[PDB]
């Protein structure tokens, strides 16, 4: 009858094991937080210097670097898988706003450079509004959906660790902090989770990108500010899920300038980097709203889709979130990984002369129609 005490490190010692034991005590308290809001506050109450991640960035292989920070595998192509007169939607998609850009009179921009960019925003907003109404009868989900215009989505995640090279804290171990802030042109928020495109724990031979150099070597800077995880709306909003996300690439990153800059190959990278960053951050926030965090991985896969357009070409991306444990401690033994499916950007039309649109491609619209018609089972 020997009551041997557990063979564990002393809590009050100044050592790695003792510090780890103290860390566990705090992490136990996080597990003991009843409300989801309390969990977010505890995780973000302390502000520390962290990498600032831009969803749209010109860095080479930024999508690959983002995947390494996110643990996302990007498979090329779309994810594995009521008549409406597709021809009627070829025009009900409102070439009328393409007709209105020639009719609707508005005060000329002073800059003279934003004229092109302003035109693209007007058409996209009008097209989105009409499409939601046109597709509402077929898919009841669209009726209950919430449409967000140029609102911010934020996610804060930790992956990896680093050793301080110098200073008063030289040699101390600190985690690599990342923050993603995105403002999608449009996104749709629904109260019900979308249907999964593949069962959770799905495994493929492809491997996540690995980065040899430090994040700072690629242009990236750390700053200390509030840590935020946002789905595009507060937790009080009933629509804690979403249907689709819409993005518009700026003129600087458009194909013509990139080809002149010799970064023609990076056109797809810009599409991928924005899609992965926007969808992962947006998907991650949704899971946190459900109470799933790093030490409590999601029990159900979280899926989302987003479309990125350069003003003429349109690309479709689908993301599935499988792991919320991305920290070295939380991801120490995790077999699950995040999966992203993307498609190449395709033109939606050719030109708009006179007062009509010529060269409109229904195939891209069909993907939008096919995407919009999808609903949870």
């Amino acid at each position: 009858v020997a009551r041997y005490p557990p063979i564990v490190a002393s809590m009050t010692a100044d050592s790695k094991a003792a510090r780890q034991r103290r860390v566990q005590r705090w992490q136990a308290t996080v597990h003991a937080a009843p409300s989801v809001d309390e969990k977010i506050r505890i995780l973000t109450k302390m502000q520390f210097k962290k990498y600032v991640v831009h969803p749209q960035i010109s860095a080479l292989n930024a999508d690959r670097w983002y995947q390494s920070f996110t643990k996302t595998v990007f498979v090329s192509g779309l994810p594995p898988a009521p008549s409406l007169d597709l021809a009627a939607l070829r025009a009900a998609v409102c070439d009328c706003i393409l007709q209105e850009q020639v009719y609707v009179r508005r005060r000329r921009p002073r800059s003279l450079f934003d004229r092109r960019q302003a035109l693209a925003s007007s058409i996209l907003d009008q097209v989105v509004r009409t499409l939601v109404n046109l597709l509402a009868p077929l898919n009841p989900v669209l009726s209950t959906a919430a449409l967000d215009c140029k609102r911010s989505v934020d996610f804060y995640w930790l992956r990896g660790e680093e050793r301080i090279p110098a200073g008063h804290r030289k040699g101390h171990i600190d985690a690599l902090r990342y923050q993603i802030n995105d403002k999608p042109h449009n996104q749709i928020r629904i109260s019900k989770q979308l249907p999964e495109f593949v069962p959770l724990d799905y495994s493929i031979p492809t491997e996540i990108p690995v980065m040899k150099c430090k994040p700072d070597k690629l242009p990236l800077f750390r700053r200390q500010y509030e840590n935020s995880i946002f789905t595009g709306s507060k937790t009080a909003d009933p629509c804690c899920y979403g249907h689709t996300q819409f993005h518009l690439i700026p003129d600087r990153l458009k194909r013509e300038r990139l080809i002149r800059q010799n970064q023609a190959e990076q056109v797809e990278a810009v599409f991928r980097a924005n899609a992965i960053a926007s969808l992962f951050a947006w998907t991650g926030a949704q899971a946190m709203y459900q109470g799933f965090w790093s030490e409590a991985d999601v029990t159900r896969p979280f899926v989302s889709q987003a479309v990125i357009t350069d003003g003429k070409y349109f690309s479709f991306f689908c993301y599935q979130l499988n792991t919320l444990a991305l920290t070295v401690q939380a991801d120490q033994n995790n077999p699950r990984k995040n999966l992203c499916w993307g498609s190449q950007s395709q033109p939606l039309y050719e030109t708009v002369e006179d007062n009509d649109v010529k060269g409109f491609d229904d195939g891209t619209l069909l993907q939008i129609v096919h995407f919009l018609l999808n609903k949870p089972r």
């Binding site: 009858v1 020997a2 009551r3 041997y4 005490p5 557990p6 063979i7 564990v8 002393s10 010692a13």
Partner: protein
């Protein structure tokens, strides 16, 4: 009857506690002569607690408090205590070592746990009986 060490009486216990824990793990520790003598008494008394038995609640409480590392508690009852069951005392051996060349010239001594598997220390050897003086005394012994 007690040396003044550390910053306070509790520190002495903690300092003694740390020294006792270190000795058990390694079985041979080098420290200042004054400190080594102070900790020698505690080490011998602890072995008596180990001999008392594992099931003894007081021994378990004493072992837990004195030994910070809990892996040592099985060792005391299954290594240290069984080893010295035959012996009635003198469990610890303390010997003088040349003073430290650390600019303070403190008195240095080595305290070791007897019966250990460590290499034998260079202990002093008494004069052999073959010496002329010893032989003469032996002759006196034989005559008597």
């Amino acid at each position: 009857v007690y040396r003044r060490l550390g910053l306070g009486p509790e520190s002495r216990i903690h300092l003694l506690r740390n020294l006792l824990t270190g000795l058990v793990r390694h079985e041979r520790i080098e420290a200042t002569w004054a400190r080594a003598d102070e900790m020698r008494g505690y080490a011998e008394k602890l072995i008596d607690y180990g001999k008392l038995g594992d099931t003894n609640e007081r021994a378990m409480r004493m072992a837990d408090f004195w030994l910070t590392e809990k892996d040592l508690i099985p060792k005391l009852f299954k290594v240290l205590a069984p080893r010295f069951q035959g012996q009635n005392g003198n469990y610890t051996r303390m010997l003088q070592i040349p003073n430290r060349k650390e600019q303070d010239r403190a008195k240095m001594a080595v305290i070791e746990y007897k019966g250990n598997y460590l290499p034998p220390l260079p202990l002093p050897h008494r004069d052999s009986n073959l010496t002329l003086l010893n032989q003469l005394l032996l002759g006196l012994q034989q005559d008597l």
